[PDB]
C-alpha cells in the first residue's frame, strides 16, 4: 500500500516506465514488514515457519539487486534492459505480497493459516 513520488520536471518517456518497475518495490515493502511482525511468538508455531521460509526468497531477492549494481558499473545496464531483468522478481514478490496481505486480513494462526496455503511457476 506504499505510494511513491517521482518528479515534477522529468521526461514523460521515463515516468510511464518508472511506474512499471515500482510495483516490485511496493510489493516488497509489504513482505519485509510481514516477516518482522508475524515472527512474534503470540502467533503460533505455523505463522513462524511461514515467515522463515518466506525469508529465504528475500535473501535471493537481495542477491539479484547486488548483481545488477556490479553490472551497472560497466554501464551495460540501460533502463530498458532493467525492465526485463527483474521479471522473475515481479512475479514472485507479487505472490508473497498477496499471501502476507490475506493471512493478516482475517486473523489466522495455526490450522487456518495452513488452509489458506492449500487453496492459494
Amino acid at each position: 500500500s506504499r505510494t511513491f513520488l517521482v518528479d515534477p520536471n522529468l521526461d514523460l518517456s521515463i515516468r510511464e516506465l518508472v511506474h512499471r518497475i515500482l510495483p516490485v518495490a511496493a510489493s516488497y515493502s509489504a513482505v519485509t514488514r510481514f516477516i518482522e511482525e508475524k515472527s512474534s511468538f503470540e502467533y503460533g508455531q505455523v505463522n513462524h515457519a511461514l515467515a522463515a521460509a518466506m525469508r529465504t526468497l528475500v535473501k535471493e531477492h537481495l542477491i539479484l539487486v547486488s548483481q545488477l549494481e556490479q553490472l551497472h558499473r560497466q554501464g551495460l545496464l540501460s533502463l530498458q534492459k532493467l525492465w526485463f531483468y527483474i521479471q522473475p522478481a515481479m512475479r514472485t514478490m507479487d505472490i508473497l505480497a498477496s499471501l502476507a496481505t490475506s493471512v493478516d486480513k482475517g486473523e489466522c494462526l495455526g490450522g487456518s493459516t495452513l488452509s489458506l496455503l492449500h487453496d492459494r511457476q
Binding site: 514523460l12 518517456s13 510511464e16 516506465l17 540501460s78 530498458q80 534492459k81 526485463f84 521479471q87
Partner: protein, 173 residues
C-alpha cells in the same frame, strides 16, 4: 538521429513524434502501426474466464519478451532504411497475431481445438513454430485433468467421458 525514436516505439513508450523531405511519414507509419499491436497485446494479455485461457495468456508473454529481446540488442545506431527492411520479415508476423486474438474468444476445449485448426490451415509457412509453441503450452493444464482419470472423431469422444469416471471412482476405493 531519429533511430532511438523509431526503435523506442516497438517498446510502447511514447516519443516526441509518437503520441497516443516529407514522405518519411509514410515510411514512419509502416513501422508505427507495428507498435500499435504490441501495446494492444499487453493490454490484452496482462492478467495471470478459464484455466486454459490463462496458460495461453501465460504462453504469449513467453514470446513477447523474445520480441523485446531481439530489439535493443543489435542496432546501436543504424541507417533509417535498414530498420524498415530488418523489421519486415518479422513485423508482418506481429500483425498476423492480431488476426488470431481479438486485437468473442472461445475458452475451454473450444479454444484448445480452435487453435489446433489454425495449424493445418497455415502449416508449411513460417507460422508453424510460433503457433506450435503456443499450442504446446496452451494444452499444458488440460493434460493434467486428463492425467487424473489415468470435429474430432466421436468414436473416441464418449469413451473419454467414461475412461475418467472409472479412475475417479477407484480413487474413492
Amino acid at each position: 538521429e531519429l533511430v532511438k525514436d523509431v526503435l523506442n516505439v516497438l517498446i510502447g513508450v511514447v516519443s516526441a513524434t509518437f503520441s497516443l523531405p516529407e514522405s518519411i511519414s509514410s515510411l514512419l507509419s509502416e513501422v508505427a502501426e507495428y507498435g500499435t499491436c504490441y501495446t494492444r497485446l499487453s493490454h490484452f494479455s496482462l492478467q495471470p474466464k478459464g484455466l486454459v485461457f490463462q496458460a495461453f495468456t501465460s504462453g504469449l508473454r513467453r514470446y513477447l519478451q523474445y520480441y523485446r529481446a531481439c530489439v535493443l540488442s543489435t542496432p546501436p545506431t543504424l541507417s533509417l532504411l535498414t530498420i524498415g527492411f530488418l523489421f519486415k520479415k518479422l513485423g508482418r508476423q506481429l500483425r498476423y497475431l492480431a488476426e488470431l486474438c481479438g486485437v468473442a474468444f472461445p475458452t475451454g476445449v473450444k479454444l484448445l481445438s480452435y487453435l489446433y485448426q489454425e495449424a493445418l490451415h497455415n502449416c508449411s509457412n513460417e507460422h508453424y513454430p510460433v503457433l506450435l509453441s503456443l499450442l504446446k503450452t496452451s494444452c499444458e493444464p488440460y493434460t493434467r485433468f486428463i492425467h487424473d482419470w489415468v470435429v474430432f472423431l466421436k468414436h473416441i469422444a464418449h469413451d473419454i467421458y467414461v475412461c475418467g469416471k472409472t479412475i475417479n471412482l477407484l480413487k474413492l476405493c
